[model samples]
Target chain A: TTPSMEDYIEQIYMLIEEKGYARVSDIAEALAVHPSSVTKMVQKLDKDEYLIYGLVLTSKGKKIGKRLVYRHELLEQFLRIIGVDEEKIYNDVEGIEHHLSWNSIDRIGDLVQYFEEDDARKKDLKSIQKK
Target chain B: TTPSMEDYIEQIYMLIEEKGYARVSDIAEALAVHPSSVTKMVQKLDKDEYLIYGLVLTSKGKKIGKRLVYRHELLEQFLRIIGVDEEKIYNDVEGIEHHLSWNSIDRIGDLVQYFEEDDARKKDLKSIQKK
Candidate 1:
């Protein structure tokens, strides 16, 4: 799927979990894109079996939605572990996740796991050069 | 500027640096895009005054081109410091450089600088959890 589609699916998946349904306006607001663009992508996703009417997910759609959300969360975790500014994490993840190959993402997951398993190391990174 | 424009400008700038001039065919080959696509963007860039008749950059174009190349180099440096697989660095940088804000890019630059400044720390991160 295109990066654009993944973003829409990711947002829709979150809205479903949070509020049990997603509206075009909600997606537009979350993405900071126009309502027309949201509508167009929603229809395209629906046709592609990734979404349905009322912003529900089909079985295939649910699978993609779940993975997209996972990728986002994983990227967020990686950024934090690397000492990225808290305010910049979301934008950084959004910018990075779609472009990465799953193998690269898996490698990052391993990196994050390594850091998480070593609190001292992770903290050292966050505190680097402060002295 | 749009990511697409940045990419074109980047390739053009590099070509000029490497060979003192650029051609549409060279750009299409380097970007792995169709000649028609390159032709279209070239015209757009030319019309916008970022490029000229012979794929030469105007002063305004040179500034953007230079910055884009610098951003690409910085991203490549950061990815390497993080121990991203060598095979993945180029693709990752291309995927990443356009999406990052200059502020975020600068932050990453500082991260890379920290790694480069401390040999023990940089080597330690690369060898992390390997034991």
Candidate 2:
């Protein structure tokens, strides 16, 4: 799926969280796109086994969306670890997320866990504090 | 990065895990590529800031590899969540892992946790017994 598809899925998940069900209008509004665009993409998602019951996600969709959110967190953490400017990194990650492999993404998660567990690394990271 | 790049990185990480260091030949053997090809790709990775000290990974490379592994686990879990044939799904995930977003990846992680925590969902899932 493309990054836009992830955004739509995330939006649907959020709308479901906020309002219990998602409609094309709600998704369009949340994503700030035209309703027709939402309609087209949602239809495609439906074909791809990602949506069911019009706008709501199927179980598979929920699972994929949950994974996307987790990867977002890992990417944020990786940017922080690499000494990249956080805001710029956030934007870059959004752009890059669609293209990053699960393997790479999972590796980032493990590295974060490893760093948090490594006392020496934590100390070193803490020493480079921003003024 | 492409799948090949990820394979190299993962091979390096695994080699490092198993033996505490990775050389070009070790990675070549693990991935079954020619040593000269490994040398070429290692040089490219070094140029990309993913390798250092001739063959070892940089901190950034380690972080990416860790994240990749995490994504692999999540993808497998998602396949199970969606009732896909697990063996075939594993191969598909390997091909598609490089293209999923962190947002989608994270969402899958969350969905797994959500399903694990949801007693009703867990019961529903378990009731569909496989022979």
Candidate 3:
């Protein structure tokens, strides 16, 4: 999906998460775009199976977007594990997320989980748990 | 993170995912934004530790962005397992991803894995594996 669509999906997710519902204005204000623009994108997302209702996300939208968020977090963990500079890796991953194939993404997910499961390494790793 | 930022990150991720690296013009074209606007947001993302360079993401940026992508996919799988309408659940999860706590996300991850591990259940559950 294009980043613009991804942004709309993420916004819908955020609004729903924050308010249980979303509106065109809310998204417009959040993204600093015109209401018309938001509406246009919202329709596109709906068409792409990433959104539904006037402001609500469709089932496919929720599933794919949620998984995207999880992948974001996992990638962070993996970069940390390898001792890559946090900032540089973040830039790289941001550039990389949209293009990654599911197969490769899953493999990386498994690798991160494997590292998370390692008793010896787990303790040294920073916890993503919110304090 | 706000959905807008997530979207940008996702976009950068997608661009980077599709191509080994991303450029400002590339992102601008993909996002259909003016070059100035992309540059502005790119700077903001950089300030937020989500991006770096002209178009590159930072280490922290990559890590978090990658995790977000992973989360998006995982949520999709969970929704499918529970028999939610693929479309509706996708919308709901999109709304939920940004607000969901990592703790809850990890727990859900474990639950999904448990289901994946159950031989009987795994057979019944559709595989996320790409053919």
Top-lDDT candidate index? 1
Question: What C-alpha RMSD separates each model from the true structure?
Answer: 3.6, 12.8, 13.3
**Which is the winner by TM-score between candidate 1 and candidate 2?**
1
lDDT string, candidate 1, A1-131, tens digits: 89989989999999999999999999999999999999999989988988787778999988988999999998888766666677888887888788987757765676677678768765665565364
lDDT of each: 0.83, 0.70, 0.66
* Interface RMSD after interface superposition, model 1: 3.0
Error of 3 at B79 (Å): 1.0
CAPRI-style docking class of model 3 based on DockQ: incorrect
How far residue B35's Cα lies from its native spot in candidate 1, in Å, is: 4.4
Model 3 per-residue lDDT tens digits across residues A33-102:
9999987887777787776764667788898668777766776675565445555555545544555455
| Candidate 2 error regions (>4 Å) | A1-131, B126-131
TM-score of 1: 0.77
- By summed lDDT, the worst window of 10 consecutive residues in model 3 chain B runs over B122-131
For residue A94, model 3's alpha carbon misses the true position, in angstroms, by: 28
* Distance from true location, Cα of B49 in model 2, Å: 1.4
TM-score of chain A of 1: 0.91
The sequence of per-residue lDDT tens digits that candidate 2 reaches over residues B3-71 is: 688878877887887899998788888878899998898888889999885367889899988888888
lDDT of 3 by residue, B76-112 (tens): 7765554455556555556556654465466456545
